[PDB]
């Protein structure tokens, strides 16, 4: 098939869909399904029952939210199927699914059944001509245009570090932890409860996530900032009321680097990055320090680069160059890399044909990846 492939970066928090030709993901929206909060049986209420994309943002107060993906693993497969069908809607891509081949993106070290069921859904419910599932860490280097680097993809659900040297991936050096943007949002909810502000509702999870996106910075010296009197930045709720966030602004994201404060048994973003570098072979390590590529939304935290540089400096060997290449487009780097990959003619030899899936069965999608 010579039609333009469709690239669908499958985020835990925000999915990004588009065509491979485009330089940017033309379509992108949160990865959740919004249902009416009350069990509607009367007429005149929010009809349809399934609000996805900006529609869910229009009436966000009245909806109960449910994410299908958690920690990069699909939980509600019906909701994920609804999401993917909505990607092929009149609102997004205005096209039939049977025409275009598809490139998915999946987190590394995920369950095999997740990928198997995703392929089954994309080949059975949608009559797609072909499919290919890539890791986002491989795609970030495609997007940046470099052949080597350590990709630290800190998405909404999963935070993983992957070193690649000259296009060779180190499967045993990959590091992965579940402390990511959603966990930072949960900790921010807890700290805002400590401020005296309640966000119990699932819908209110969205506005505490908005507070995380708007006003939350990583302090190089958290003790000094805590001792220093905070400015108590004011934030506007959707309804109209103001809130003073206070010191929680710098306490919630701090758990990404030091999760053990809240008792979480996790390595921390700097720890997984450094250990992914160190587990690799020794001769590569210096170059792996000289090419660090950030990716994912959680890397967009204010002052994240400086704190990560400080941590890597104090953990790395002395007098070793470090280059945390943090492109401004790091939120959509994974999709841009997927588009660049799908543009290549080599992609023609990578995706599995529908007849190939029918004949070889499930194991094809496992073996053609590597």
């Amino acid at each position: 098939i010579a039609n333009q492939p469709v690239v669908i970066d499958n985020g835990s928090g925000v999915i990004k869909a588009g065509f491979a030709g485009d330089q940017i993901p033309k379509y992108c929206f949160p990865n959740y399904v919004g249902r009416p909060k009350h069990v509607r049986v009367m007429a005149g209420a929010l009809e349809g029952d399934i609000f996805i994309g900006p529609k869910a943002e229009e009436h966000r107060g009245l909806l109960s939210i449910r994410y299908p993906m958690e920690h990069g693993i699909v939980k509600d497969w019906n909701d994920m199927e609804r999401i993917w069908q909505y990607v092929y809607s009149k609102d997004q891509l205005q096209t039939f699914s049977e025409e275009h081949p598809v490139l998915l993106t999946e987190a590394p070290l995920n369950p095999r059944k997740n990928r198997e069921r995703a392929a089954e859904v994309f080949f059975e419910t949608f009559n797609v001509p072909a499919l290919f599932i890539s890791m986002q860490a491989v795609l970030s280097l495609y997007a940046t245009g470099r052949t080597t680097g350590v990709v630290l993809d800190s998405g909404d659900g999963v935070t993983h570090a992957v070193p690649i040297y000259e296009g060779f991936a180190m499967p045993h050096s990959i590091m992965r932890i579940d402390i990511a943007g959603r966990d930072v949002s949960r900790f921010l909810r807890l700290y805002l409860r400590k401020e005296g502000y309640d966000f119990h509702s699932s819908s209110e999870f969205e506005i505490v996530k908005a507070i995380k996106e708007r006003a939350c910075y990583l302090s190089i010296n958290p003790q000094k900032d805590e001792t220093l009197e905070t400015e108590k930045a004011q934030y506007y709720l959707p309804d109209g009321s103001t809130i003073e966030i206070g010191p929680s602004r710098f306490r919630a994201p701090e758990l990404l680097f030091r999760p053990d404060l809240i008792g979480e048994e996790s390595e921390g973003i700097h720890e997984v990055l450094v250990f992914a570098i160190q587990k690799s072979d020794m001769d590569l390590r210096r170059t792996l320090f000289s090419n660090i590529v950030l990716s994912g939304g959680s890397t967009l935290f204010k002052g994240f680069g400086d704190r990560l540089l400080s941590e890597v400096k104090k953990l790395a060997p002395k007098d070793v160059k470090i280059r945390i290449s943090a492109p401004q487009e790091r939120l959509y780097s994974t999709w841009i890399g997927g588009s660049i990959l799908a543009s290549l003619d080599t992609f023609k030899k990578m995706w599995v044909s529908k007849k190939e899936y029918e004949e070889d069965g499930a194991r094809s999608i496992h073996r053609k990846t590597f």
């Binding site: 940017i24 680069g305 280059r323 945390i324 401004q328 790091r330 939120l331």
Partner: peptide, 24 residues
């Protein structure tokens, strides 16, 4: 640069490279 101007989450007014000081 402007090709990413329309996207929501493009974080601007920040440096694109955080690196240690070069040594001869």
């Amino acid at each position: 640069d402007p090709k990413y101007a329309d996207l929501p989450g493009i974080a601007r007014n920040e440096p694109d490279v955080y690196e240690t000081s070069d040594l001869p």
